[PDB]
Amino acid sequence: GSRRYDSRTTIFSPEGRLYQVEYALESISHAGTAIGIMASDGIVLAAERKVTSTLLEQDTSTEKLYKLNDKIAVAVAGLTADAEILINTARIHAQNYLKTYNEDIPVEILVRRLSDIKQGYTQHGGLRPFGVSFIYAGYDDRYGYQLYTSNPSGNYTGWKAISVGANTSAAQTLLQMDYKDDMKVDDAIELALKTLSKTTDSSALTYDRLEFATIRKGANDGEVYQKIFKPQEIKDILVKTGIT
Template identity: 55%
Template sequence: MARRYDQRTTTFSPEGRLHQVEYAIEAISHAGSVIGIQAKDGVVLAGEKKETTKLVDPGKRGEKVYKIDDHVIVAVAGLTSDANALVNRARINAQHYFSRYGENEPVEQLVVSLCDYKQQYTQFGGLRPFGVSFMFAGWDRHFGFQLYQSDPAGNYTGWKATAIGNNYSSAVPMLKQDWKEDMALDEAVHLAAKVLLKTTESSSLTSDKCEFAVLTVKDGKVSHRMLTNDEILAESKKLEQEQQQTTTTTTTS
């Protein structure tokens, strides 16, 4: 039955579904995991890098985290080509706003403008939905630190902590259990590493396997940076020690 209604983006099935949009969302579920966590003093984004072959140069592989503007960064899950097109559009929108008003565009307004554009590709014939989901981290003077997630249909939601991509269904319960209202940024980084290590089912984390970005405010100015390989390895080692302590405690009891 579905094959009769999945040839056109604008054709609803008898159940009220748009199959092309659902196919785009399904493509994202096979992409590398992305974790987003909002803390009281910043936001952390962590993304898994999918290694297709060892012949690929890690230094020239596509990015997982992009800078939109000085106050907004984004992590992507899905088709890199679609992500590049939308990231460039978001950057242009942010610069247009700055040139017109002389200040950074509010984070939610930037998210809304991009989601409206994504939604147009589910509304008109001859187009296909973008096969990518975004995780936005930003700060503005209106609402402070913010974390948003958007999908191919153009929906967006504000979150305190969430996950997209492969094994997101395993990541969300862990975030729900361990996230705290007064969580500091370093605690958020540690939690993101813990969840990412679980979802990737890897023995350790390195900069070749994942990316970590933190956004915070220092001296009244928004700043963001990527964690170095040494910092990622330190978090991985800390998780390994915690696992050993848990195992020892369990064995003793």
Template identity: 55%
Template sequence: MNMVTERYARYLAEHYNEARRYDSRTTIFSPEGRLYQIEYAMEAISHAGTVLGVLAKDGVVLAAEKKVTGKLLDLSGVKEGGYGGSGEKIFLLNSNVVTGVAGITADANSLVNYARQAAQKHLFAYNEDIPVELLAQRLCDLKQGYTQYGGLRPFGVSLLYAGYDVHYDFQLYHSDPSGNYSGWKATSIGANNGTAQSLLKQEYKDDMGVEEAIGLVLRVMSKTMDSTTLGSEKLEFATLTLDPTTKQPKARIYKPAEVDALLVEQGLAKKDEDSEMRAV
């Protein structure tokens, strides 16, 4: 081993040992003022299935890429009852808030349960649905606490909140493991979020309606998903609109058959490989 190689090896060892001093706890700042465990959590999220949200003038649209798929997976409950969805990526938090998650699903389940309890406590105390930003703040307070106390790791999940309240109409928020949150007109989390953000910047319009937003979300998902085909086995979809009769928020998480019908309507349905083979 020559002198240059030895010097480089020594530098790497020193740098590695230095980093280990600051990433062993969530509460220790590095000399640059960074919390490495938070950055590691956000890196885990960047490998999760893509989640897109688009805010329209009369609603909000969410779409998410499912990662857990398989022919032997029992989806009978998904097809027959409830709000639809597989319970993997999109959840109903309250009658006025739907969320899409990217990251560790087990962590997401814990936060979803916490958010549902917070929403019900607000409803019980004030006899009104919880404002969307307040619900995001409640979850972010919890997530920030996990960056401040020793012996705890951050939640490895980011969330998009699609909601409606009488104060600020339709809203779309994003929160990350650090406890930061922000409002968006259109945004993406998870894998390929940079590409998705670029496409959304090019095509988003402030005055678009829900139908246009649905088309935009599906087009962007078709270009950014890791899968070569777009179908209900890989995609979850939800909208939040106002009921024309009651003027109350109406959340709709699409069932697999409804997702496939929507893809056909938008001209993005996957091709039938068997029929292609027969044609050949």
């Protein structure tokens, strides 16, 4: 019968590893680097677009940074099409929570549910896992500013600063070197860009090959604002830090 052609996506190796999860992580390691840095008064999300073409429409494009609700955003690393499936699910989950409790969803709860969906694909159903790693950047009134990451295994962890995708080994060393706890958003913005600038496989880091976003309490009095940076705004912030 059909048994002959079954890859058996949800099994253990003799060493106790999940083949497909490991190979999905190998896939993600070739994806454009994405960095999240959490400051005391906000969060920065920076991501490198995958080898851009000059005829690509840059201003009306979304590849790396997506908005889940007004308080939570994600940086993507891996298959975009896979990520969008998960993003729509996450968006719906946040609205279900709001409809049920009349309160915005706590960041961890949203992250856990999305990570639980990934877990399911590694344990049952016989389907391939989602080849996606997320960096969740968000705010709620319990824990304040939070950074998380999830990967195809369905395992998630919290971070002060973290990178996913390509050159994470080199990127994490640089973040671990210059990061400190009393950091501001404007400093974190500079760190994020400096790290990408050194870990990039490109010749030089330019505005057209980047996506950038901040989550500050920079709005008027006790409320959070999400800023998905425009091309010109990235061009300005790149000059302001002295990279170009």
